[PDB]
Amino acid sequence: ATFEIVNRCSYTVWAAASKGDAALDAGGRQLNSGESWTINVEPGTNGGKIWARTDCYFDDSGSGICKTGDCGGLLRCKRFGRPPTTLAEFSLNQYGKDYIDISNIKGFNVPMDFSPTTRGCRGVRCAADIVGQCPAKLKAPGGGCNDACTVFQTSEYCCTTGKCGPTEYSRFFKRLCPDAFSYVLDKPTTVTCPGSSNYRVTFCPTA
Numbered sequence: 001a002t003f004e005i006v007n008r009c010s011y012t013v014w015a016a017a018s019k020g021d022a023a024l025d026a027g028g029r030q031l032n033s034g035e036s037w038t039i040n041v042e043p044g045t046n047g048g049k050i051w052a053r054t055d056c057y058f059d060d061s062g063s064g065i066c067k068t069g070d071c072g073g074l075l076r077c078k079r080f081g082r083p084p085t086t087l088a089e090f091s092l093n094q095y096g097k098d099y100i101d102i103s104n105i106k107g108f109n110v111p112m113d114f115s116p117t118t119r120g121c122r123g124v125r126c127a128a129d130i131v132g133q134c135p136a137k138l139k140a141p142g143g144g145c146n147d148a149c150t151v152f153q154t155s156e157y158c159c160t161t162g163k164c165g166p167t168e169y170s171r172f173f174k175r176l177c178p179d180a181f182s183y184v185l186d187k188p189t190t191v192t193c194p195g196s197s198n199y200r201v202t203f204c205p206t207a
Helices: 148-152 168-176
Strands: 002-007 013-018 023-031 036-040 048-058 064-068 087-094 097-103 112-116 124-126 191-194 199-203
Touching: 002 013, 002 023, 002 048, 013 199, 023 036, 023 048, 097 112, 097 124
Parallel strands: 002 199
Antiparallel strands: 002 036, 013 023, 013 048, 048 064, 048 087, 087 097, 097 191, 112 124, 112 199
């Protein structure tokens, strides 16, 4: 399956793609403002994620650091990135269907639209200004807006015991972006698409 990753932001981002234990495609690449990078993700990929990273520096071997989303200092991500990171999430060819969603469970750094480019389902979007409206105690000095599990490390925010409810913090994400997961046990906003669909992830989809 192809995912075209498009940076509509006015700033550079470094796209990253991983299923947690491996890169997807090259795993990572710089996208200047306006650039598009098309990756191929193997069918049957379960638990895939794509995200943006900001204010990165990499040396000639592709080692360095990003202020949001850093995946162990690599340009070419093989693991998930350091919060805060708005997440495009997908599981492909799961008993004949694709599942896609956006999640704010690991915080928010960059607005995002995640849409199929092929027929038979709708896209999801979290493009509100969550960084600018971020509650004081969630603001990441590094840039972006942390989820409350990252900041406070409690069973309630992290949903460790599997029994959590919504919180003042999760309700901020859900209000800014009703169509993204705001906490682990949020009512799902996962979209079911045809097996083997193709996709576009757009950073900063709106003005």
